[PDB]
Structure formats: structure tokens, C-alpha cells
Ligand binder design. Structure first.
Ligand code: HEM
Ligand SMILES: c1ccc2c(CCc3ccnc(N4CCOCC4)n3)c[nH]c2c1
Ligand SMILES: [Cl-]
Ligand SMILES: [Cl-]
Ligand SMILES: [Cl-]
Ligand SMILES: [Cl-]
Ligand SMILES: [Cl-]
Ligand SMILES: [Cl-]
Length: 395
């Protein structure tokens, strides 16, 4: 009979990869698909072709925002913000931004440990079941990013509550996204004017804003950096830690190994990154030339989607890809943080947030287990991350 063009995304479930990804990678590692907008796109699912796309800048991030392009989903930010990191570099701020978002600031890791332990103590006081997303992973991400930005902890929750809309993956524009964006930009602009904000990313930007070497950088860009790095960081670390906790909980042996030998936690977190399904969609790129990718000549103006778990579960690159193995010879060679020009600038911070969160959880809750059958988790739909709405656990 007549069937329709394969639709993406395949599944919003973040606890398991569909058997179909490996079939696709074997048969057609670059394949035409239809996005939620009705646009056509090329879905790339092997490690070799994913790397190729990500390392060829003729597959452009910023051109995805062009009027009239085939879209994966609607913009939730102004179109110039799709080029955020390019704009930051053009302003001469890349080195300073990247320095402020490392985990190296004195006291930062101790703050993370302290926060995690306090969050966990409060759950233990309250009694099982506990929700490890809403009452551990996300608050820990939110607290971390207020500290990194230099802004009050008490301002965290409001900025955070924009994110269930900001990171939607929608066929159509979202009126609430503009409402929240304008509000959060105004908040950050106020932060730059606030004399009490002297530390973290916003303290440093606020100084640079008054330094004559940056007098022609726009105020809008300074506020944009705060909103976008808070939102990207919080959504990415909170969502990654949440689904890494599921993967750990599902593996009691690994849980007990990391609990007994916490010096292995970094290698375990690197494998959890490798197998992580937090990104709900392929990474989008627009071709700016005709480019051969595998068996397909991608044409100028076409949309390409780089499926991270396609690369990261590719057995040609990671043998026994579904197994967490702490002694792989190529352990950071995954694509969890992307690759190339747009490699995640928060990568070290994201690693440390997950390592510290996991270390603290295994110490406080060595008997942690799901308090519901895994199929009872509710997976968020039409979102840029795969997130269970609640993560009920007992210990
Ligand atoms: C485990 C945590 C994280 C994961 C898995 C993650 C993942 C990624 C990925 C895959 C990309 C590449 C997107 C692409 O090429 O289209 C990216 C880029 C980006 N990430 Fe992260 N991220 C994480 C944490 C962070 C943090 C903590 C921040 C900031 C505080 C951050 C800020 C950004 C920004 C601003 C970009 C865009 C870079 C560019 O366009 O050059 N991420 N992230
Ligand atoms: C309302 C509307 C949008 C937001 C955001 C940002 C959402 C978003 C979407 C897509 N890309 C990106 N980034 C591109 C790369 O640089 C990092 C940021 N950021 C935070 N809070 C909001 C409130
Ligand atoms: Cl399946
Ligand atoms: Cl345009
Ligand atoms: Cl919602
Ligand atoms: Cl200049
Ligand atoms: Cl070529
Ligand atoms: Cl390979």
C-alpha cells in the first residue's frame, strides 16, 4: 500500500533507544524524513556521517534561521540568536564567556556539593517517594547556573519556569515564548545595571560593558548572553542528569560499583553521556552548497539533522554500544556535546554537574530505586529534550 515519508522524531522516550535507529543506520545512514513542520530533511545516523556534517561548516547552523528555509521546528528566540556564539565571538567576548562557565571558579564545586547534599537531605527528611527531576536534578542545575552567572539564587525559579516553553520543539511560533523572552531579557538588562552583581558571568560582562574596549557592543547582546546561557545550561544539565540517573538506577551493579569506587564516577559519567538520549531531535544544519554525504548529494538549501544517538550507538565506533563500559579506548569521542565549530562551550561544567550530583546521590541514597514501573514515567513531548515529567524514586 501507500505509506508516508518517515516522520521525526521517532520516540520521545528517553530511557531506551528504538530498535529502529540501528536498522536505519545499517540500511540508510542518511535518509529523507519529514519534520513536524511538514518540511523534508536528511536524517544522518552513523558516526562517520554525523562527524562529517558537524565538521563541515558549509552545513550551517545560522542559516537554519533564514526566512523560507525548511524548518525542524519554529524559532523560540529572535533569528539573530540562532547565531548566538558567532555574535559573542564577533563582540570579542568568547574567551571571557567560556572562562566564566568552567567549573574552575574557586568555591564552585563546593557549592555544587553543598547544594546537592542539602537537596538530598530535604528529600530524605520528607520521606519516599521523591521526585529526582523536579526536586533534585533541575533545582541543582538552577542553583548551579545562578552561581555561575553571579545572580541571586532567589531569581532562579522564575527564569527556570520559562524553560518548559523556551525549549519547545513546535511546528508553529509560540506566543508565550516571546512573552517570557522579553521579560527575561529585561531582567538580565537590570542585572547589568545592578551594582551588587560583581561575580560570575554577569559580573564579568557588567565590567566589560563599561570598559572602553567594548563600548560598541550592544546592551542587547550582553543581556542575551545571560538569558541564553542560563537557559541552555539549565535545560541541558538538568535533563542530562535526570536521564543519567534513570540509566544508573536501571543498573544496580554499576550503581554499586560507582558507590564503592567513586573515583570511577568520571568514567561512568562519560559513558552516561555517550548513551544519553536527552536531545529529542537531530541537530539541525542548512546546506549552503551541494555536498556529498554518503550515498546522497545534499543540495543547497536543504535541511540536515544530525542524530546524536545515531552516532553514539554506532557499533562501528563503540562496540557493544548499549553497554556501559568504563575501559573503552575512545571514551570522550562521543558526540554528546556535538563536534566542530559549535562544540558545547559548557561541556566541562556539564560533566562536573553530573559527576557531583551522582556522587552525592550514591552517598546519600545508596539504595535508590524507581518507585514506579519504568513504563509509568511520562515523557515530555514536542520538546527539544527528552524529559520524564516526574522521576519518582525510593531508597
Ligand atoms: C550535560 C550537559 C550538556 C549537554 C549534553 C550539552 C549539549 C550540547 C550540544 C550537543 C551542543 C551542540 C549543538 C549544535 O551543534 O547544534 C551544545 C551547544 C551549546 N551548549 Fe551545551 N550542553 C550541555 C551543557 C551546557 C551548559 C552547562 C551550557 C552553558 C552554561 C551550554 C551551552 C551551550 C551553548 C551556548 C551552545 C551553542 C554553541 C554554539 O552554537 O557554538 N551547554 N550543547
Ligand atoms: C523565552 C524564550 C527563549 C528562551 C531561552 C533560550 C532558548 C533557546 C532556544 C534555542 N537556542 C538557544 N540557544 C542557542 C545557542 O546559544 C544558547 C541558546 N536558546 C532561554 N529562556 C528563554 C525564554
Ligand atoms: Cl522499538
Ligand atoms: Cl532571513
Ligand atoms: Cl508545556
Ligand atoms: Cl572593535
Ligand atoms: Cl564536497
Ligand atoms: Cl565509525
Amino acid at each position: 500500500t501507500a505509506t508516508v515519508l518517515l516522520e521525526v522524531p521517532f520516540s520521545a522516550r528517553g530511557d531506551r533507544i528504538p530498535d529502529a535507529v540501528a536498522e536505519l543506520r545499517t540500511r540508510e545512514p542518511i535518509r529523507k524524513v519529514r519534520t513536524i513542520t511538514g518540511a523534508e530533511a536528511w536524517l544522518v545516523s552513523s558516526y562517520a556521517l554525523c562527524t562529517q556534517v558537524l565538521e563541515d561548516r558549509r552545513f550551517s547552523m545560522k542559516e537554519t534561521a533564514a526566512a523560507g528555509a525548511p524548518r525542524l521546528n519554529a524559532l523560540t528566540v529572535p533569528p539573530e540568536v540562532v547565531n548566538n556564539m558567532g555574535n559573542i565571538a564577533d563582540a570579542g567576548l568568547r574567551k571571557a564567556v567560556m572562562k566564566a562557565i568552567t567549573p574552575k571558579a574557586p568555591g564552585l564545586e563546593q557549592f555544587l556539593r553543598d547544594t546537592a547534599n542539602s537537596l538530598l537531605d530535604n528529600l530524605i527528611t520528607e520521606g519516599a517517594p521523591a521526585d529526582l527531576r523536579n526536586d533534585f536534578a533541575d533545582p541543582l542545575a538552577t542553583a548551579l547556573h545562578c552561581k555561575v552567572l553571579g545572580i541571586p539564587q532567589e531569581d532562579g525559579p522564575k527564569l527556570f519556569r520559562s524553560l518548559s516553553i523556551a525549549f519547545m520543539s513546535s511546528a508553529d511560533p509560540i506566543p508565550a515564548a516571546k512573552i517570557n523572552w522579553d521579560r527575561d531579557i529585561e531582567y538580565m538588562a537590570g542585572i547589568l545595571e545592578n551594582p551588587n552583581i560583581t561575580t560570575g558571568l554577569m559580573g564579568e560582562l557588567s565590567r566589560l560593558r563599561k570598559d572602553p574596549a567594548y563600548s560598541h557592543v550592544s546592551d542587547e547582546l550582553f543581556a542575551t548572553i545571560g538569558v541564553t546561557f542560563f537557559g541552555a545550561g539549565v535545560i541541558s544539565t538538568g535533563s542530562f542528569l535526570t536521564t543519567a540517573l534513570i540509566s544508573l538506577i536501571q543498573r544496580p551493579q554499576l550503581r554499586n560499583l560507582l558507590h564503592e569506587k567513586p573515583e570511577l564516577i568520571p568514567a561512568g559519567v562519560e559513558e552516561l553521556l555517550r548513551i544519553n538520549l536527552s536531545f529529542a531531535d537531530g541537530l539541525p544544519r542548512l546546506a549552503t552548497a551541494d555536498i556529498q554525504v554518503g550515498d546522497v548529494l545534499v543540495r543547497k538549501g536543504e535541511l540536515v539533522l544530525v542524530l546524536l544517538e545515531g552516532a553514539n550507538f554506532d557499533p562501528e565506533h563503540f562496540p557493544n554500544p548499549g553497554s556501559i563500559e568504563l575501559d573503552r579506548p575512545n571514551p570522550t569521542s562521543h558526540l554528546a556535546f556535538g563536534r566542530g565549530q559549535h562544540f558545547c562551550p559548557g561541556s566541562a561544567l556539564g560533566r562536573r554537574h553530573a559527576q557531583i550530583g551522582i556522587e552525592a546521590l550514591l552517598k546519600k541514597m545508596p539504595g535508590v530505586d524507581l518507585a514506579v514501573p519504568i513504563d509509568q514515567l511520562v515523557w515530555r513531548t514536542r520538546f527539544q529534550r527528552r524529559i520524564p515529567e516526574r522521576l519518582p524514586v525510593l531508597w
